[PDB]
Amino acid sequence: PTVHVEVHQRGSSTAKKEDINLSVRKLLNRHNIGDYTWTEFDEPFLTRNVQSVSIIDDLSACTVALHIFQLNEDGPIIAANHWVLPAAEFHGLWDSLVYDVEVKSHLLDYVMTTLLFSDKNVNSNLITWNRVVLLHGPPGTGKTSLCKALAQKLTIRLSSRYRYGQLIEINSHSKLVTKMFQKIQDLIDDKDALVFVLIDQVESLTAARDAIRVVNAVLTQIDQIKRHSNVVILTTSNITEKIDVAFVDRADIKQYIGPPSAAAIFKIYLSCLEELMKCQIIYPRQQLLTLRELEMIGFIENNVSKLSLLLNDISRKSEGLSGRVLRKLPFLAHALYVQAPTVTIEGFLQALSLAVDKQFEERKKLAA
Ligand SMILES: Nc1ncnc2c1ncn2[C@@H]1O[C@H](COP(=O)(O)OP(=O)(O)OP(=O)(O)O)[C@@H](O)[C@H]1O
């Protein structure tokens, strides 16, 4: 039963990966026992070369797969943003996206099997696969982030097959096309690279419809690059119910992404409050309980539970908000209702509650 361990090698490190592979395995044998991350090590070679060793889904002998990676520090071809993968900009993006249904797992597995099928030359006339992915759902769901985070994950997890990755994010809002796709082809010519091309909000092309010619040229250019073994095409759409030309039939991986449920919201807020405690904007630090812990005490209210119960109740009246709004509310909370360097978590929860109420007042104003 395989167990994945992501090893973040320092940018300033010049050690061979084989040496890091040997150290990290020796460390894992020391401890020998859920998801856990190391940021400090007794051993100096690890201190010197590794920023984190993180175990991702209590046991010892499993088949253990390490993925050692080194963030490419400098970020960005216009109209296109370009990142070498793994990119320092996308570090932690994956974990920042909380979904209900374990969408991220399936999404990774689908594209994994797609790349495996590409790589072994499975006749697509006999088993259905292709290099196009469509994330659709309402705005603010994390679709674009999830594409970038998926590209990063795939690159980190397929280091054995590809030495590095590439992400080109075409901005829907925009001859010159042929120059930008010349650039992308030159990246693809390096078969050590796994190249991702991301077309944000594809519905914008059929909505923005000279504009006829610009669209048909991008289609023919996409059709040209999806012919290559090391290409994945990522697309998103904010109109989920509407069929679309022509990425709908274009995509053997379609995936709905919807707004967070009250459970997901709770985990989302927890990740925000943890960060504020880490940075000590919330002080002093208090323990917060998970929903599972609350459920184990029957949601009795006491000193351990009171504030976590209050957060749970804030999560419930946040239902309806998108994740974009949700990760923005702690900033609004702090800016509108604290406006001081430091606040107890009692005071912040109460600030966040007001902010939430303020969102729906604005919503109701947009209605009338
Ligand atoms: N499920 C979620 N959990 C945590 N944060 C989220 C979630 N969904 C959205 N967000 C926050 O909102 C930010 C922006 O979302 P993003 O713009 O990727 O969503 P989108 O509107 O679906 O994408 P686009 O409109 O560009 O196609 C994310 O980086 C994330 O911080």
From Swiss-Prot:
Example of a GO biological process term: male meiosis I
InterPro entries: AAA+_ATPase, ATPase_AAA_core, ATPase_AAA_CS, ClpA/B, P-loop_NTPase, Pch2-like
Signal peptide residue numbers: none
Phenotype when changing V195M: In OZEMA9; uncertain significance
Molecular-function annotations in GO: ATP binding; ATP hydrolysis activity; identical protein binding; transcription coregulator activity
UniProt xrefs under SMART domains: AAA (SM00382)
Record-level GO cellular component terms: chromosome; male germ cell nucleus; nucleus
Binding site for ATP: G137, P138, P139, G140, T141, G142, K143, T144
Keywords on record: Acetylation, ATP-binding, Differentiation, Disease variant, Meiosis, Nucleotide-binding, Oogenesis, Spermatogenesis
The protein's assembly and partners: Specifically interacts with the ligand binding domain of the thyroid receptor (TR). This interaction does not require the presence of thyroid hormone for its interaction. Interacts with HPV16 E1. Interacts with proteasome subunit PSMA8; to participate in meiosis progression during spermatogenesis.
Function: Plays a key role in chromosome recombination and chromosome structure development during meiosis. Required at early steps in meiotic recombination that leads to non-crossovers pathways. Also needed for efficient completion of homologous synapsis by influencing crossover distribution along the chromosomes affecting both crossovers and non-crossovers pathways. Also required for development of higher-order chromosome structures and is needed for synaptonemal-complex formation. In males, required for efficient synapsis of the sex chromosomes and for sex body formation.
Family as reported in the entry's similarity comment: Belongs to the AAA ATPase family. PCH2 subfamily.
Illness the protein is tied to: Mosaic variegated aneuploidy syndrome 3: A form of mosaic variegated aneuploidy syndrome, a severe disorder characterized by mosaic aneuploidies, predominantly trisomies and monosomies, involving multiple different chromosomes and tissues. Affected individuals typically present with severe intrauterine growth retardation and microcephaly. Eye anomalies, mild dysmorphism, variable developmental delay, and a broad spectrum of additional congenital abnormalities and medical conditions may also occur.
The name this protein goes by in its record: Pachytene checkpoint protein 2 homolog
Originating organism: Homo sapiens
